[PDB]
């Protein structure tokens, strides 16, 4: 829990006194520059150590190392002497000098895992509990299995873990993209550097889009060779033996084509195709890529060192609520308290109960056995107790797994530190909340006693259950219209009974599993056992419909096993990276640290470091948060051991962001609340200091590691008005082919704002674009990249040449927007630039409508010169405003429709009833109805995110808004009517031409 250079001081002085404690037993106050390296300090100290007493009995400086107290309070031994004083994150400025005993300099130099990770590794060592310790150890078995895979075939397997192919999955082109080619083939410029001047020789090529890079190389070979005259048989030998001695790189960024994919299938190219720009690749020596990718180098660490069945028990479940510790409200203003309990499986099984309203608020005691009406053998595996200490309101809540990670039923006494209730939760008990004791010990602590039986009770294993499963063992055909249905729709008791009734019949419509599973009395025993038998050998289903089964409503290990088995069979490295945001937040619902999902994700992170990169950052994002701080800690550690050398590069960037975080913390809080002028000479002068130039120059971009952030431009770096104090930063692209793709890497860094909503919305946006694309609509969105690196810290990708509509429209005239875009796209390029606007607009319109993006405006929307518009700064998300009022309230109509319709119908005086408007209006209909048929994918993606403390997604009724935006009970036409009626609806976010809302006259 900390920030900057020293405890309480955000930024060290240009020089500080640092107390050096020598081993001769004496204190040597030393004058230091904040920049100074530890190697240079030691050296300077040791000259000054001669002028103090006992100077002879000290040894040579190289027989010594420094130690101090870090800002997270622990003895850090500074073995790496590169480091600088400011970067040391010291508590107080003082240094102890010791002999560097306690060896493995190498292993003790993985207190960088503890820095990059967010929690120091020492803390995991000093942890009780077996599960945590069991996890750290056994998870290393997943890590070997990774390193071994990525090292068999050592040259190529390596350059495939770093730099995996960016392939779009399914070679098959949509035929509307294919026609943009020309005779089913595409032009391609292949560049090559040569010995002297870095002479960039180009070689252009027409080639079949579907051919593999191997072949593109060969076509290159022909062009260069066959200028000189030679046989057909010669060329064919020259290819044979040198075809594969080269590789292809995209010009501008570290993204290679190292795989036998159709050249169109690579994202770079297919992007070039539909976008209508010409791909520029670089031909590189295969040997020179391989030579500069190091050793894998994984070594393991220090941490490598009379029961019953459940079904024997013949009694109801009972639980003694013993007594609390304390609770914070005043006796007078309301004084009745009772602990409300209830056992759960996600949604309630046993008909739950309260406890006696005895309200000694002074000393909350009860000592009453609560007797629930469930038989102990009927209890499913995922059974868990939920509770809260309520008032005559919730107050403080908590949850408990009724079984250990070992499968043991809990017994006897135990305490449970309770959590506080979230902001917008009123509902007494909390079952979708995290399961365990509050790590915060300074909180309400409620005590329990479960029963102890003769000996330690254990849940049965598969084989024994299958014995019991066997022991127990048309217009009906068209109630598969049950599985053609949104997953938060609910199903009546007949529908549950019907589904269950015909379960054997069900296996041939595999889609219905989430509804069949939802129709099982989990409080059964016999039913669950028959089910466990079906799900064992259930036929696999599509990645998307299976990852529903990994959300919070399917908490059974058997169920989830089947979800993960689906995932590892299907679900490409493409679509895995796509949905990675969602799968990391869905771990939150898994009872025990070591589960098949955590395994699958970790292997993939260590198989493909593009996944690894985001898998890391997505986990570090939630590391301030104590709910998952433990779980994500131990997982993130295990990524950091097995990742090879990317830990050098993750470190480089986590140190970079930390410098920004702490710099902007000065501009916010500290005596830096005044003019742009004062803050810009401060910031720009601070950025010139060495510690700073090194932290933020020469590293990779967290938004995308492909682009290298080179030198700071610095003269381009600036600050926004907003009292968040966001930074606009400009780096060079230090590539030799800089000038071909991006020579400006510009990024928005940001404190204060929870970027997480933007991060999700921009994901949804992309998926909609894919649905529309593959459906043959060409509505072009701009899902610019944006990563949350932490607690209201983020990064946002800057689109070049964009402007906000405000800037562009500043008497005022509605035509103004159009009569500018005309000016930027003169004459011949005009009809094309308006097409872009009209399609762009249509998409963003239908998109923001569906998701209900928060009240939008003038600087929310942007337009590029070429005419593509795009929305930014989504923040408050799907309705949500409804919480502030608590009613279907009237809101500002989208006033910009005027400006936009003029650009849509070209300078038309009248534009509401045009040939042009019909064409746009159509597009919006097409795109809206298109998403409807893919509706469920969206409902699932949002419900996986329930875990995250996003304020807009803290319940299911929140998601239910997307049912209202789509057609819920409505059929295509009815739904097209709802849409249009809500679009032409003034004072409901829409538009008419009254041109006198506000006053009415």
């Amino acid at each position: 829990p900390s920030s900057g250079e020293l405890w309480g001081i955000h930024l060290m002085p240009p020089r500080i006194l640092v107390e050096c404690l020598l081993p001769n037993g004496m204190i040597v106050t030393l004058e230091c520059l904040r920049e100074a390296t530890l190697v240079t300090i030691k050296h300077e100290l040791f000259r000054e150590a001669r002028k103090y007493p006992l100077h002879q009995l000290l040894q040579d400086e190289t027989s010594y190392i420094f130690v101090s107290v870090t800002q997270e309070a622990e003895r850090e031994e500074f073995f790496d002497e590169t480091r600088r004083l400011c970067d040391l994150r010291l508590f107080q400025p003082f240094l102890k000098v010791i002999e560097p005993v306690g060896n493995r300099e190498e292993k003790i130099l993985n207190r960088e895992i503890g820095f990059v990770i967010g929690m120091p590794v020492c803390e995991f060592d000093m942890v009780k509990d077996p599960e945590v310790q069991d996890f750290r150890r056994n998870i290393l078995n997943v890590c070997k299995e990774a390193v071994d895979l990525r090292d068999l075939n050592s040259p190529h397997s390596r350059a495939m873990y770093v730099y995996p192919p960016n392939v779009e999955s399914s070679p098959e082109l949509p035929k509307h993209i294919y026609n943009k080619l020309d005779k089913g083939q595409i032009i391609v410029v292949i560049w090559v550097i040569v010995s002297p001047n870095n002479d960039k020789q180009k070689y252009t090529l027409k080639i079949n889009h579907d051919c593999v890079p191997e072949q593109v190389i060969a076509e290159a070979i022909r062009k260069k060779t066959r200028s000189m005259l030679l046989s057909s048989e010669q060329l064919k030998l020259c290819v044979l033996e040198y075809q594969g001695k080269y590789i292809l790189k995209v010009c501008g960024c570290d993204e290679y084509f190292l795989e036998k994919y159709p050249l169109s299938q690579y994202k770079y190219i297919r992007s070039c195709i539909m976008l209508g720009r010409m791909p520029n690749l670089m031909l590189m020596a295969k040997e020179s890529l391989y030579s500069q990718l190091p050793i894998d180098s994984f070594t393991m660490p220090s941490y490598s060192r009379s029961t019953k069945s459940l079904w024997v028990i013949n009694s109801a479940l009972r639980i003694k609520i013993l007594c609390a510790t304390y609770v914070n409200v005043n006796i007078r203003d309301i004084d009745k308290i009772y602990v409300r309990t209830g056992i759960y499986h996600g949604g309630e099984p046993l008909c739950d109960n309260v406890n006696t309203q005895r309200v000694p608020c002074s000393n909350p005691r009860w000592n009453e056995w609560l007797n629930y009406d469930i038989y102990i053998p009927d209890l499913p595996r995922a059974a868990r107790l939920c509770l809260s200490i309520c008032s005559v309101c919730p107050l403080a809540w908590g949850n408990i797994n009724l079984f250990d990670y070992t499968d043991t039923l809990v017994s006897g006494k135990m305490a449970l530190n309770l959590w506080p209730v979230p902001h917008g939760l009123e509902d007494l008990l909390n079952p979708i909340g995290v399961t365990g004791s509050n790590p915060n010990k300074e909180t309400p602590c409620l005590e329990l006693e479960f029963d102890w039986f003769s000996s330690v009770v254990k849940f049965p294993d598969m084989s024994v259950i299958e014995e019991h499963a066997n022991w127990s063992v048309n217009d009906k055909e068209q109630l598969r219209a049950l599985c053609t249905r949104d997953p938060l729709s609910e199903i009546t008791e007949q529908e549950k009974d019907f589904l269950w009734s015909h379960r054997h019949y069900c296996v041939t419509i595999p889609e219905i599993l989430p509804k069949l599973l939802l129709s099982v009395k989990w409080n059964s025993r016999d039913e669950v056992a028959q089910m466990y038998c079906l799900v064992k050998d259930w036929p696999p289903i599509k990645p998307e419909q299976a990852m529903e089964l990994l959300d919070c409503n399917y908490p059974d290990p058997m169920v989830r096993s089947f979800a993960v088995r689906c995932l590892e069979k299907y679900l490409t490295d493409d679509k895995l990276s796509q949905y990675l945001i969602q799968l990391v937040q869905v771990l939150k619902y898994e009872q025990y640290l070591d589960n098949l999902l955590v395994r699958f994700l970790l292997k993939k992170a260590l198989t493909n470091q593009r996944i690894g990169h985001f898998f890391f950052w997505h986990l570090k994002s939630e590391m301030h948060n104590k709910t998952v701080s433990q779980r994500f800690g131990l997982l993130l550690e295990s990524y950091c051991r097995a990742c090879g050398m990317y830990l050098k590069h993750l470190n480089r960037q986590v140190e970079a962001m930390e410098k920004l975080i702490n710099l902007t913390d000065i501009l916010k809080q500290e005596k830096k609340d005044e003019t742009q002028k004062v803050q810009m000479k401060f910031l720009v002068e601070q950025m010139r200091q060495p510690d700073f130039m090194d932290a933020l120059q020469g590293f990779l971009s967290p938004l995308n590691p492909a682009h290298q952030l080179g030198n700071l431009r610095l003269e381009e770096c600036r600050i926004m008005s907003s009292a968040k104090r966001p930074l606009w930063l400009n780096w060079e692209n230090p590539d030799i082919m800089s000038e071909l793709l991006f020579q400006n890497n510009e990024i928005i860094f940001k404190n204060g704002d929870d970027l997480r909503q933007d991060m999700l919305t921009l994901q949804i946006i992309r998926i909609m674009e894919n649905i529309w694309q593959n459906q043959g609509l060409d509505l072009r969105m701009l899902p610019y990249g944006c990563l949350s690196i932490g607690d209201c810290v983020g990064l946002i990708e800057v689109v070049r040449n964009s402007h906000t509509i405000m800037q562009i429209q500043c008497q005022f005239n509605s035509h103004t927007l159009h009569q500018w875009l005309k000016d930027k796209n003169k004459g011949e390029i005009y009809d094309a630039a308006i097409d872009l606007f009209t399609r762009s607009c249509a998409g963003y319109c239908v998109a923001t409508f569906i998701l209900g993006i928060g009240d939008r405006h003038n600087s929310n929307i942007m337009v590029k010169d070429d005419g593509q518009l795009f929305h930014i700064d989504f923040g408050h998300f799907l309705d949500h405003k409804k919480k502030k009022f608590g009613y279907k309230r009237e809101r500002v109509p989208f006033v910009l429709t005027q400006d936009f319709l003029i650009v849509i119908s070209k300078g038309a005086q009248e534009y509401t009833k045009t040939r042009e408007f019909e064409r746009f209006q159509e597009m919006c209909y097409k795109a809206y109805l298109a998403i409807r048929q893919h509706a469920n994918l969206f409902i699932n993606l949002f419900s996986m995110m329930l875990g995250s403390g996003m304020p807009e997604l803290q319940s299911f009724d929140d998601i239910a808004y997307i049912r209202k935006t789509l057609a819920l009970d409505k059929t295509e036409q009815e739904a097209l009517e709802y849409f249009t009626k809500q679009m032409n609806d003034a004072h409901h976010g829409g538009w008419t031409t009254k041109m006198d809302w506000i006053f009415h006259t």
Partner: protein
């Protein structure tokens, strides 16, 4: 009268937000400071250990000088012990002052919990008090 309960609703509601923002903002400074308390304890622990190394390695030298009547050199050795224990006094004065801010936060935090719970149920009523008036006429706002 909705105009009547909208005045109660917005006052209780928007005070809960000033109240809930002081809750989690204080809560951070609580654990923040407490882990600074921890760092103090390792610093006072290391400064005591340095202090114990003077009194070790000093014994034979300090006597040797007393014998030779050096004084001028004895006074340099003690001058350094004088700094040493003086700076550990400051660490402790600094620890104690942070120790109270922590206790003070302990008090004022619990009071934000107290009154935060006090606001909850009385806001729960005011909201569905407003249901009574669902009886065009959207203007009593």
């Amino acid at each position: 009268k909705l105009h009547e309960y909208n005045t109660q609703f917005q006052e209780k509601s928007r005070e809960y937000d000033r109240l809930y923002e002081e809750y989690t903002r204080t809560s951070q400074e609580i654990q923040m400071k407490r882990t600074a308390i921890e760092a103090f304890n390792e610093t006072i622990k290391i400064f005591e250990e340095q202090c114990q190394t003077q009194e070790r390695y000093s014994k034979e030298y300090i006597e040797k000088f007393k014998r030779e009547g050096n004084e001028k050199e004895i006074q340099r050795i003690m001058h350094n012990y004088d700094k040493l224990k003086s700076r550990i006094s400051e660490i402790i004065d600094s620890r104690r002052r942070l120790e109270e801010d922590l206790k003070k936060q302990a008090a004022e935090y619990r009071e934000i919990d107290k009154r935060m719970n006090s606001i909850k149920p009385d806001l729960i009523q005011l909201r569905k008090t407003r249901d009574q008036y669902l009886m065009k006429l959207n203007e009593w706002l």
